[PDB]
């Protein structure tokens, strides 16, 4: 019988890309009390992987759902954890202060109503210059950044900030597909894929203009972009090996507790032990030059061989143009100019000192009025990390021929998550399939 | 007041029964993999529906949703397997897979005459997954492919 | 210290085939439709249930319920469709609808020996709709004809 008959097959290995929500597993988690220790499966340490043979698939990092996940999810969860914490409304009282004895941080005093009736005026609040806003000519009286938009949520003393390895996996009916290929562009077809039960460890580090503690490239430094032609989009540079950087510590200090309400506690810094020290980071100058060179090579690969220029940030708000940095649960904003002050063409110290500012009022993700207050950490904070990549932007106003100009990049944090999620897809399984064959469903 | 009749076996009635006889109570177990509020009552259903409604706005209602969904998943977790195998229920069924003695050599006269289901179960815990997979491939391999070909003229 | 044995081909390994070979492992594929944590999975499942004890959270927690319910519903949707078609069990089920060459006329040999399910999907995607309808009519007429 030349005429073929329809036969239904069930359990047919096919898939379609589709939007869904993944199941977070906060691997390897008084504890306490972050990351998603209360919004994500406690532990899932052992990933599974199945290699596929003669298959191909098209990947597109720049439109990948999983980023939107983390972008919402992280904000959501971080926000959540602060709901039951103290709102420092009394603190908005007009402060009066004085530079601390050797420009400088200041030793402030202020009236505040607490306990019963009346108030206690004489205080020892050591605030950093970039947390306050001077009012009225040269008077020493003023108030915190933008109290007009609340910005007073004190992060619970018990809540840590430490970024921990988290994994994502797919719910029943979905599968995570990964491109098993070195040099993968981040955009286009992959000729060697495999499925995974979960992703590899992700490290949710909030930082800007600088990719820290991520995954490394294997052969040679790589540069990814949605559209190199389009000068308005940020490019992502992933190092072939990391560059270690050690960031330092302020004056040693003691945290003071201030009673502000019926159990409401406000923490600040009141006592300095020993000399006043400048917080900064140190990095090998030579090593930076080494890997910078590596990058430059590939930048040249992207436009013939035009000379490469690195200019520091265009200028503006420190919280935008300096590189933010997490360490010890405190927030640094450091000047990066020394790292982006070079030109490269056809052809000093040992390390670089990068001065940092230490802030306490932090506006996370440029939210409107939802800024927080970071309580101070007793003692000094020593931390060191590994630079694993860069976020760069090509200057749209390049009018000099023979050169290509870059500045520290920009955009939101979505790009920051891309640095890990650039090889994963989430697809839905479609069990039912139908194909012709030479057999008829017999009656009776 | 309330007076009482008689079994009518009963839930888990065969739990300690010798497997040979316990094998004939499968109807009781299967009947209740979705329950504990059986029969109208008919005030219990009324109450449960009332709490399912009233508590729809709060955590305790959510915990009931959680439990209910769990029940369904567990049910379907077994139905899926029974569907995949050529054993749509039917309380029992046989396969083409030969018993591999590596799993257990024990004599059937010991099994069916002096052992509970739980004792028996202890002995095959580590071979469960293997056994399933072998049933699965036996189901597909030939019993379905060749079957298709047996209607091929 | 963990050692590795043999296959026993796992989840989606069949994608490399070749529909002729893809008739195998249909169970391997199907069996995992309701779980990404198949098996007791000591030191996983325990945490999976522990997490569901922690559903005093709102918004976030409830999203997981949505996920679970949709998984169940997705499964059941397919089960109903197969029931309608008279394919209650299981893997392979032939119909009495003759293949319309309009949909495709590639050699049978091409299909099974040198074509992959993913491709097949792409090729006859636009006809899926009416194919299903026709299958329903078959079973409908069979309900009455078998009387």
């Amino acid at each position, epitope marked *: 019988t030349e005429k073929l008959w329809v036969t239904v097959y069930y359990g047919v290995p096919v898939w379609k890309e589709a939007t869904t929500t993944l199941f977070c597993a906060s691997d390897a988690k008084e504890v306490h009390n972050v990351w998603a220790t209360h919004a994500c499966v406690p532990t899932d340490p052992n990933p599974q992987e199945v290699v596929l043979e003669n298959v191909t698939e098209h990947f597109n990092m720049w439109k990948n759902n999983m980023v939107e996940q983390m972008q919402e999810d992280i904000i959501s969860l971080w926000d959540q954890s602060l709901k039951p914490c103290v709102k420092l409304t009394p603190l908005c009282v007009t402060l009066n202060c004085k530079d601390v004895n050797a420009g400088e941080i200041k030793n402030c005093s202020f009236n505040i109503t607490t306990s019963i009736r009346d108030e206690v005026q004489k205080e020892y609040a050591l605030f950093y210059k970039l947390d306050v806003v001077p009012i009225d000519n040269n008077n020493t009286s003023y108030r915190l950044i933008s109290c007009d938009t609340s910005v007073i949520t004190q992060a619970c003393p018990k809540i840590s900030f430490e970024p921990i390895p988290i994994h994502y996996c797919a719910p029943a009916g979905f599968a995570i597909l990964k491109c098993n290929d070195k040099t993968f562009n981040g955009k286009g077809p992959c000729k060697n894929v495999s499925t995974v039960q979960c992703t590899h460890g992700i490290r949710p580090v909030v930082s800007t203009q600088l990719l820290l503690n991520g995954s490394l490239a294997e052969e040679e430094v790589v540069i990814r972009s949605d559209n190199f032609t389009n000068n308005a989009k940020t490019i992502i540079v992933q190092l072939k090996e990391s560059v270690e950087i050690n960031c330092t510590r302020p004056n040693n200090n003691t945290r003071k507790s201030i009673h502000i309400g019926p159990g409401r506690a406000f923490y600040t810094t009141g006592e300095i032990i020993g000399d006043i020290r400048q917080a900064h980071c140190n990095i090998s100058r030579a090593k930076w030059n080494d890997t910078l060179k590596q990058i430059v090579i590939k930048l040249r690969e992207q436009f013939e061989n035009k000379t490469i220029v690195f200019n520091h940030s265009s200028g503006g708000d420190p919280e935008i143009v300096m590189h933010s940095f997490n360490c010890g649960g405190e927030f640094f904003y450091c000047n990066s100019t020394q790292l982006f002050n070079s030109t490269w063409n056809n052809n000093e110290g040992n390390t670089i000192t990068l001065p940092c500012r230490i802030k306490q009022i932090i506006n996370m993700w440029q939210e409107v009025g939802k800024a927080m207050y970071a309580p101070p950490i007793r003692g000094q904070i020593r931390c060191s990390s590994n630079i694993t990549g860069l976020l760069l932007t090509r200057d749209g106003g390049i009018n000099e021929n023979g050169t290509e100009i870059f500045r520290p990049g920009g955009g939101d944090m979505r790009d920051n998550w891309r640095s890990e999620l650039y090889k994963y897809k989430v697809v839905k399984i479609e069990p039912l399939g139908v194909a012709p064959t030479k057999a008829k469903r017999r009656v009776v | 007041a309330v007076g009482i009749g008689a079994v009518f076996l009963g839930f888990l009635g065969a739990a300690g029964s010798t497997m040979g006889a316990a094998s004939m109570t499968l109807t009781v177990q299967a009947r209740l993999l979705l329950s504990g509020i059986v029969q109208q009552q008919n005030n219990l259903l009324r109450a449960i529906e009332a709490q399912q409604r009233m508590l729809q706005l709060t955590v305790w209602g959510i915990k009931q949703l959680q439990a209910r969904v769990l029940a369904v998943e567990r049910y379907l977790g077994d139905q899926q397997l029974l569907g995949i195998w050529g054993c749509s229920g039917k309380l029992i069924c046989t396969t083409a897979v030969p018993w591999n003695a590596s799993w257990s050599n024990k004599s059937l006269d010991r099994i069916w005459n002096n052992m509970t289901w739980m004792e028996w179960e202890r002995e095959i815990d580590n071979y469960t997954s293997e056994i399933y997979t072998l049933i699965e491939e036996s189901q597909n391999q030939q019993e379905k492919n060749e079957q298709e070909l047996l209607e091929l003229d | *210290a963990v050692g*590795i*044995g043999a296959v026993f*081909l796992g989840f989606l390994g069949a994608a490399g085939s070749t529909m002729g070979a893809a008739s195998m492992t249909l169970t391997v594929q199907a069996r995992l439709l309701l779980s990404g944590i198949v*098996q007791q999975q000591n030191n996983l499942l325990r945490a999976i249930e522990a997490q569901q004890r922690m559903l005093q959270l709102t918004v976030w927690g409830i999203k997981q319920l949505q996920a679970r319910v949709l998984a169940v519903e997705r499964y059941l949707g397919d089960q109903q469709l197969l029931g309608i078609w008279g394919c209650s069990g299981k893997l392979i089920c032939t119909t009495a609808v003759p293949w319309n060459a309009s949909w495709s006329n590639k050699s049978l040999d091409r299909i099974w020996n040198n074509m992959t399910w993913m491709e097949w999907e792409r090729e006859i995607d636009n006809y899926t709709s009416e194919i299903y309808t026709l299958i329903e009519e078959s079973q409908n007429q069979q309900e009455k004809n078998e009387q």
Partner: antibody
Amino acid sequence: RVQLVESGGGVVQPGKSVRLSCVVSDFPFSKYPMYWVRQAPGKGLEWVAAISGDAWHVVYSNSVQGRFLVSRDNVKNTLYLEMNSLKIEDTAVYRCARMFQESGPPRLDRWSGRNYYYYSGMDVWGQGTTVTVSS
Amino acid sequence: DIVMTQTPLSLSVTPGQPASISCKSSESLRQSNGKTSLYWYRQKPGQSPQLLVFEVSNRFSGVSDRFVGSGSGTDFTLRISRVEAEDVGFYYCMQSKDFPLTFGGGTKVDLKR
């Protein structure tokens, strides 16, 4: 005991091949994977090789990879470690030992389809035998 | 490969004086079944290897009560309470999370004189 007995040692020249044998008294075997280790005259301990309880999975140390051969006979209750192409560095006292926990049968993972084995530390050693190399 | 080291090789003790040996690992030994894959061993000159503890803070049956394991994360320890003069000998840390199975420094306890 679980009494471990080893023999077949001595001194041999480089490039030769040997066999070491290990017999254990009063011991199930089928439920227990076994180890071979190396105590060097250079005063250190090295793991050399491991073999599953049912002799279906064997792992070698990187230094002996492609040189040594572990095998089993669970009916005769005996382990064998042969050694091909001996090099001078291999001069050492080799010790036959047994694992600490019991091992169950390999567990088949239904998601990946891989048949996994689980290993562990060890609790009983013999005294092994000295095997030296050169002239 | 997982590698690791122990305290400096020569540890002198006295009868009745407790003493401890740590073991620093290159990677946390968390195992997939929810436990930590760390073992301690010892042996005397002319004496085959003996098992001291088999889990972190869980000594092995037959081993004296003096032996108290502890520690966590990436760096663990073994403390012997009330060290006896007969506790001298070589001490080894051993990891079993992955292959190859490796050993620590191989320290040795001896007496003060």
